[PDB]
Amino acid sequence: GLVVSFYTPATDGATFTAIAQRCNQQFGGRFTIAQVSLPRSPNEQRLQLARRLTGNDRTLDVMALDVVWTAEFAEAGWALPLSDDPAGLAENDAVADTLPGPLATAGWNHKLYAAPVTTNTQLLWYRPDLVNSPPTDWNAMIAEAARLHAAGEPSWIAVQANQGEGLVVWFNTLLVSAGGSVLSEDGRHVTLTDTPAHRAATVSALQILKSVATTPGADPSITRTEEGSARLAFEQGKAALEVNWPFVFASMLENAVKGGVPFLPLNRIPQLAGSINDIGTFTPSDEQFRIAYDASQQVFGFAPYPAVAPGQPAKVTIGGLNLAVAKTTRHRAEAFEAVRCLRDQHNQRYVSLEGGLPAVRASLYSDPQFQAKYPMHAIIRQQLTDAAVRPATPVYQALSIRLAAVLSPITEIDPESTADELAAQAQKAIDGM
Ligand SMILES: OC[C@H]1O[C@H](O[C@H]2O[C@H](CO)[C@@H](O)[C@H](O)[C@H]2O)[C@H](O)[C@@H](O)[C@@H]1O
């Protein structure tokens, strides 16, 4: 039968290949989904897709889009509205049993242009054997890192951010938590410095970035261009504090069982032998999960994203992936049917428990079987309820490149002058409409 191509970030390729393989057993030979990988950064994911869409690649069917690409892809006509499903089923499927934060990321001008499949929100991860209590706010993060440094313990604050989208995400979370916003609601005005309250919020966020950058024991790689992984930095013992998306939980257990985490040698537990399956995925029994998780609790804990102001939780920038059907497809009906299978209940459970990516289905966050294997479920659902959002705008690509070039390196931030530079660069981006 026909093949529905399914483009996804390469780092999620194995997870989505597995989901596609399950979805291929249930179409009655009518068709096959074929996963195809995209590059690592959101901007290169977008670029590969945009070049196929403008090139009229008629083999491109389903795309897993970062949440920030909806406006551009809807406005360009590249993502079909869900109302273009010939079966008329896609819109109701996308909303039913789906958390509202993820859904909002999939809309443009009051219509859905994609079906959420994964969401994302950052948590604090820490070494409980080195850090007595998890820092509750950024001042406490800095104080704990300085303490670790003076004790000769690992002292980096490993935030998943370099010089790209992740740095923009970090800034956006600090900014919205402080009451600021990059753009107005409609995306037509820059709101970083246009009122005193907005300017004060921008300055407070930049002050946090600069303070973290210049804390004793800070990662010397802030001032370098080389890409870094906060996930690997922590797994290697180079940081005892990490701010990152929740896939690091699955990664900690799997890499520990593979032998890749020196302070958690789960591969030396005979009961865990053979729990990595034949293509490299940790697939434990219930007992093996208990053993691995219980052992991990001595050296790996999680907690809310640090607060920006003492006494109120942060507003944490939402992330994730939405499934869109490309205007190029020669088989809209099967592409939308594939989208519904790829996000069904069983595959949502899989994408979180094995793939490490937070599910979008509200039912799972209320399901004790899911909660038992996804122990950060309550913090995740709370942070998705009061999430910050990056600006929705068709010129997001240019806005984010401009903002990230100003913010990096964060050691060079001067709150007041950087605030004005950010606002001017943001204005250049939206002056391309
Ligand atoms: O779970 C890990 C995912 O990490 C990246 O995506 C997240 O981080 C991006 C950069 O800050 C955000 O734009 C995105 O919305 C987040 O989901 C990576 O791009 C994904 O492939 C990973 O699944």
UniProtKB/Swiss-Prot annotation:
Disulfide bonds join 23-341. The keyword Mitochondrion does not apply. It is found in: Cell inner membrane. The keyword Signal applies. GO terms for molecular function: trehalose transmembrane transporter activity. It is a lipid-anchor. Keywords: Cell inner membrane, Cell membrane, Disulfide bond, Lipoprotein, Membrane, Palmitate, Signal, Sugar transport, Transport. One of its GO terms (biological process) is biological process involved in interaction with host. Its main location: membrane. GO terms for cellular component: ATP-binding cassette (ABC) transporter complex; periplasmic space; plasma membrane. Alpha,alpha-trehalose binds at residues 66, 120, 245, 247, 320, 390. Disruption phenotype: Mutants show no growth on trehalose as the sole carbon and energy source, but grow normally on glucose. They secrete substantial amounts of trehalose during growth on glycerol. Being a receptor for trehalose, which is essential for the survival and virulence of M.tuberculosis, this protein is a potential target for antitubercular drug design. InterPro entries: SBP. Part of the ABC transporter complex LpqY-SugA-SugB-SugC, which is highly specific for uptake of trehalose. Involved in the recycling of extracellular trehalose released from trehalose-containing molecules synthesized by M.tuberculosis. Trehalose uptake is essential for virulence. No binding affinity for maltose. Monomer. The complex is composed of two ATP-binding proteins (SugC), two transmembrane proteins (SugA and SugB) and a solute-binding protein (LpqY). Belongs to the bacterial solute-binding protein 1 family. This is Trehalose-binding lipoprotein LpqY.
